[PDB]
Design an enzyme around this catalytic site. Structure first.
Site, PDB file in Angstrom:
ATOM      1  N   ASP B 142      -0.049  -8.442   1.488  1.00  0.00           N
ATOM      2  CA  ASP B 142      -0.841  -9.665   1.346  1.00  0.00           C
ATOM      3  C   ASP B 142       0.054 -10.882   1.178  1.00  0.00           C
ATOM      4  OD1 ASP B 142      -3.190  -8.117   1.433  1.00  0.00           O
ATOM      5  OD2 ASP B 142      -3.242  -7.939  -0.767  1.00  0.00           O
ATOM      6  N   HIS B 169      -6.358  -5.497  -3.505  1.00  0.00           N
ATOM      7  CA  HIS B 169      -5.712  -5.334  -2.208  1.00  0.00           C
ATOM      8  C   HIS B 169      -6.715  -5.166  -1.073  1.00  0.00           C
ATOM      9  CE1 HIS B 169      -2.315  -4.825   0.346  1.00  0.00           C
ATOM     10  NE2 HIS B 169      -2.453  -3.526   0.546  1.00  0.00           N
TER      11      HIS B 169
END
Lengths: 307, 303
Positions: B142, B169
């Site tokens: 990310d 996530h």
């Protein structure tokens, strides 16, 4: 910016190569990926999420032209990977892709990774000659896997740091045509038994991989790393770095065979200087004489495919 | 002399991760690869031909013990790149970690990270070896995606942009703190559009691959960045900061991704998420119930 095209980018070798180029090419570079498989644009999108200053795009289908436009370096890793008949499958693949290079980026440096290198480089040369664009200083057979293997095995045997060992390797890229010049490794000495054992190991190293995989694959990651080392060296030389030397299989003065791997000083025109193979030991002199017939036959196989 | 074990090394993520670690771990390191796939010993032999001072060995069969012996860092990328398949795999492998290298740092890459980290924690707690400073959900993909997209939008050098990303996530639990990017300001529309892109970036890859695969190479790179940062911190480097999903104070959820100062025993300090914009505050509140459900799913699988 410097543009590198990878033809064959969807295979294991090509993806490893593309990952290493995306992460190591100089800022401002461009990378284009091509393969038949429709996954290839997404391999590039995958890599495009890595925050390096390397623009990357991918292409699939039957036409490599959009990947080749403006390319300065073309690395060809398409076809079936070697698992130590190969000519029978890969000859036409190489011919087709080199024809597209000749039409679209004829002034690019071309690195042939597709095996059998001893033969496929001869195919590429004759294709480029038929197209009227052949530059012997810009066509390379990528033999770097033999060099990095030699470095690893010498360093392990002699207790040296692997990154500090550099073994010249001359000849060709298969079997008895692979000649590591162990006599020239600075600061290291080898018994005649060590030389015979190391040379056999280097000449058959791919079988270690295939056997440890229980027949389930080939040496894709180290081939990707070897191809990346060669490609990055070529890019450094094309951008003006001095003293960049790599062994590669090129058309030379023909003393031993028409194509022959030897140390090369690279530069902005591709090959800057074909360097002497130097002083050879008795073992190396015998190995060199012993594979000339094999190497010449490998070359003729590629020449006669085109002509 | 740090040793890194990669469990799941034969998959696409695992082979990319293994290649990057073989070429980037400090000289004198050791790398072990384990996967039930019978090719794995030869994946390691393949990598062993690269001339770096990193000793590499590969292992298959059901016993991860030889790969885990003496391991300082264990990166788990096994399984399908779904929940019931990966849940059992994570439980199996974390049990082997608990019995072989219980003081190792453990990075869970196997998705869904919001849940699989909770599975791992409950396995370790049952074994009596849990150290919440040593269990990480690897969220680094990310962060590097956020860096890439911000650098392109703002005309920055991609390697000079670092975006904090907090939360979890998956989906709306991924919260990039664009308000904290130094020297850069974003309009409200840019924040909305960048956040949506970051939260759905995996679908970009799936669609461009024509449904023929997932993000493997960038995940390998993200996991390598995290693993290399952890190794640096275990070897005494100060100031190593990475965002990762860990069991913390529980202010927002039991597990939560936030900036971490790493050190010789794993997490050295869990850092404050700082001041949040109105957009970031609403996004944080909006995903807490989802994140808590993700955690409970992992807890219940073990308990």
């Amino acid at each position: 910016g410097m543009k590198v095209a990878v033809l064959g980018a969807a295979g294991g070798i090509g993806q490893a190569l593309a990952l290493l180029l995306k992460t190591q090419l100089p800022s401002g570079s461009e990378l284009s990926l091509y393969d038949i498989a429709p996954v290839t644009p997404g391999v590039a999108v995958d890599l495009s999420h890595i925050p390096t200053a390397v623009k990357i795009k991918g292409f699939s289908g039957e036409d490599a032209t959009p990947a080749l436009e403006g390319a300065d370096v073309v690395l060809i890793s398409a076809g079936v990977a070697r698992k130590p008949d190969l000519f029978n499958v890969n000859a036409g693949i190489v011919k087709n892709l080199v024809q597209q290079v000749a039409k679209t980026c004829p002034k690019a440096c071309i690195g042939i990774i597709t095996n059998p290198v001893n033969t496929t480089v001869a195919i590429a040369a004759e294709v480029l000659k038929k197209a009227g664009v052949y530059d012997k200083n810009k066509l390379f057979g990528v033999t770097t896997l033999d060099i990095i293997r030699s470095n690893t095995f010498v360093a392990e045997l002699k207790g040296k740091q692997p990154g500090e060992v550099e073994v010249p390797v001359i000849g060709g890229h298969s079997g008895v045509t692979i000649l590591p010049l162990l006599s020239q490794v600075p600061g290291v000495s080898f018994t005649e038994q060590e030389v015979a054992d190391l040379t056999k190991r280097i000449q058959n190293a791919g079988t270690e991989v295939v056997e440890a995989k229980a027949g389930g694959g080939s040496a894709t990651l180290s081939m990707g790393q070897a191809a990346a080392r060669f490609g990055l060296s070529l890019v450094r030389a094309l951008q003006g770095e001095q003293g960049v030397v790599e062994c590669a299989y090129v058309e030379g003065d023909g003393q031993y065979a028409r194509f022959f791997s030897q140390p090369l000083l690279l530069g902005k025109n591709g090959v800057e200087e074909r360097k002497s193979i130097g002083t050879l030991s008795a073992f190396e002199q015998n190995a060199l004489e012993g594979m000339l017939d094999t190497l010449k036959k490998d070359i003729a196989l590629g020449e006669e495919f085109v002509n």
